Design a protein around this ligand. Structure first.
Ligand SMILES: Nc1ncnc2c1ncn2[C@@H]1O[C@H](COP(=O)(O)OP(=O)(O)O)[C@@H](O)[C@H]1O
Ligand SMILES: Nc1ncnc2c1ncn2[C@@H]1O[C@H](COP(=O)(O)OP(=O)(O)O)[C@@H](O)[C@H]1O
Ligand SMILES: [Mg+2]
Ligand SMILES: [Mg+2]
Lengths: 371, 20, 371
């Protein structure tokens, strides 16, 4: 039979059968209970709208993501999300399909063990396998080397790989991602008068960020230009009218990636953690990693980031090496495409964690040889 | 606490035809 | 058995069995004791004529409404009105019929508790339920969202509802209604020479208001036109002859709704309290409320109000949103039609306040889960 390539993610759940080009169903991972009282009788009001249904009734819900930073903080809601994904968005019972979840690097063990225990006890799948979210993104590019920066919505991690041999001592995981950029944008919009507070209006700020923000090639020059002319002010129409005008908030929101001091984080930007991740590698594979830097994940879709990052790394790196940044147009679904490719391989067909194996060793089987 | 209406099945806006 | 859908209102009591199209008996809610001496013996003169009987003998009575502004100020008279409604206008003993009263939003608790105590002790009904007068008017329109402006004769209230979830923090109740318009019309008629003072002549002024007054599309242009030409002066024949001619009093009486400064009230008109009620709602359901503005109640029957209100809101609202005003021809009985629909539902059949429940918790049961 065919395998189910699910990809929990944090912000958008992407799923679909193995062997295709794009995920079959992509929908936000939010579960929102209603918060008001409700007076109409017999309206058929449910107790929790999940997935894309709660992005249409969000006016009277309190949306809450079940995955904070890679890790899962609310297991009941995550179980509900998985149940919805299997039964309503794909309509395939899990009793007859292997599953291939994905997990960020350096995550707590208990999260992974609970994930496998749920998949084997509640949904009762035949066999499931958990894979690191960066190796898949490297599969999708058709490479076999390269250092991949997978800046998702929950957590940004940077896994270097050479000739198929991952370097476990050079993984640099940073917890700045799309959600913190949404919060920072929502916080700097208040400098013009627009106040978004409700958890429903966070979605509106996210839409503003997606449609308007861009990464500046040079930050100081843009700050000077936006403060003199008015060629940058782009307007946007809220879900009820009252258009708003975003000035130099456009390139200040995604600039947080390269200067995490804006949101008070100490660490260095995504332009310098990649160079540090490279320098921890051996001295003989640094040229190949320099030449095959891969971008993935949703947050790396800002217009103009593949040039800013290349300029920064070229500034840091030695002058002789060639710096090349692979930015495929299908960046958002790169991890899932790689997952489909990996699940479609014949050599991989014996790596699944078969159910009888789980019955013999318990949920701690995932840390064992079947990784 | 505010009252909680038990969940039913259906309908609404479908009697407008049968009364109009 | 069948349920009794009574609707106390303030000015017209509307009642009838659940499941019909129109109330069975509609009659003014006035109780008038005779005031003169009375010399004929054996004429069979009663001590209080209630309902529609006191609108025919009003020449020698002192009519007094038992409901001032939604609240009930004279409980004995209200009990008399209910007794008349049950026994003479419907001729069904209340011992064998559930009742569904209606109550304005934000009313004093003691009023509701006394109402339920009367219904359970004096009339001894099997089970009664109290519902907010705006949710019913939303039922009758066959919608499930929308912001309903129910401008009755006692009090005008504006309850916004989305997807069946009422928003309790956005109810704007204003105490200007049909009665204040009657008093203001009676006060501005004195500018031509016609003086109405007696409580019986208030009914004549009410008839003048119903038959002649209309809401102007633009106030200043109408004031200028009525002051030059004479195409507006419509005449009306009093109950004894001596026709009167109403000039620019025609559109000045109902203009008080949009400028409550005429009768000295501070608040803003019904055109701006709706916009304020919308703006208190969340940012994502404002488009739906803009598109589904519902009118109800008697006082919204003035010829030309559904255009003036739309023009005003379109002036206030953002230019992109579409403003639509639902004004069904059966506006007056909209609340009662909705009440009939609600009482006819199967899902609602277990929400009644059963008598044994009242015996166990006292009259304060109404504020509890059985709302
Ligand atoms: N076109 C875009 N432009 C800018 N940011 C985007 C765009 N699309 C998605 N994002 C950001 O990326 C996030 C989605 O990232 P995604 O790759 O789905 O995370 P995950 O790894 O959990 O699947 C969204 O929250 C959004 O903030
Ligand atoms: N055709 C009409 N034109 C103008 N005003 C009217 C008309 N019919 C009723 N009214 C006004 O509405 C009032 C009746 O309102 P109603 O909806 O019966 O109040 P309630 O909510 O108490 O039932 C009357 O007092 C009258 O002033
Ligand atoms: Mg991802
Ligand atoms: Mg009413």
């Amino acid at each position: 039979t065919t395998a189910l390539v699910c990809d929990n993610g944090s912000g958008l759940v992407k799923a679909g059968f193995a062997g295709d080009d794009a995920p079959r169903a992509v929908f936000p991972s939010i579960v929102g209970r209603p918060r008001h009282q409700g007076v109409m009788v017999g309206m058929g009001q449910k107790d929790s709208y999940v997935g894309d249904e709660a992005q249409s009734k969000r006016g009277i819900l309190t949306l809450k993501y079940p995955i904070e930073h890679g890790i899962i903080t609310n297991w009941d809601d995550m179980e509900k999300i998985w149940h919805h994904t299997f039964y309503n968005e794909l309509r395939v019972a899990p009793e007859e399909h292997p599953t291939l979840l994905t997990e960020a690097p350096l995550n707590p063990k208990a999260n992974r063990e609970k994930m496998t225990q749920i998949m084997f006890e509640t949904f009762n799948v035949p066999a499931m396998y958990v894979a690191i979210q960066a190796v898949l993104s490297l599969y999708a590019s058709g490479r076999t080397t390269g250092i991949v920066l997978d800046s998702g919505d929950g957590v940004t991690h940077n896994v270097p790989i050479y000739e198929g041999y991952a370097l476990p001592h050079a993984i640099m995981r940073l917890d700045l991602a799309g959600r913190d950029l949404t919060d920072y944008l929502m916080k700097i919009l208040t400098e013009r008068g627009y106040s978004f507070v409700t958890t429903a209006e966070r979605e509106i700020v996210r839409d503003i960020k997606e449609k308007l923000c861009y990464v500046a090639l040079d930050f100081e020059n843009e700050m000077a230009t936006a403060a003199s002319s008015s060629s940058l002010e782009k307007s946007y129409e809220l879900p009820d009218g009252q258009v708003i005008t975003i000035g130099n908030e456009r390139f200040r929101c995604p600039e947080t990636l390269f200067q995490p001091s804006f949101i008070g984080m100490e660490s260095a930007g995504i332009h310098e953690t990649t160079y540090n991740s490279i320098m921890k590698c051996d001295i003989d594979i640094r040229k190949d990693l320099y030449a095959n830097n891969v971008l993935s994940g949703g947050t790396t879709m800002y217009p103009g980031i593949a040039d800013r990052m290349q300029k920064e790394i070229t500034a840091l790196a030695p002058s002789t090496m060639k710096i090349k940044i692979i930015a495929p147009p299908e960046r958002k679904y790169s991890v899932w495409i790689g997952g489909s490719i990996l699940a479609s391989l014949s050599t991989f067909q014996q790596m699944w964690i078969s159910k009888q194996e789980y019955d013999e060793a318990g949920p701690s089987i995932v840390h064992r040889k079947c990784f | 606490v505010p009252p909680k209406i038990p969940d039913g099945e259906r309908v609404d806006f479908d009697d407008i035809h049968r009364k109009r």
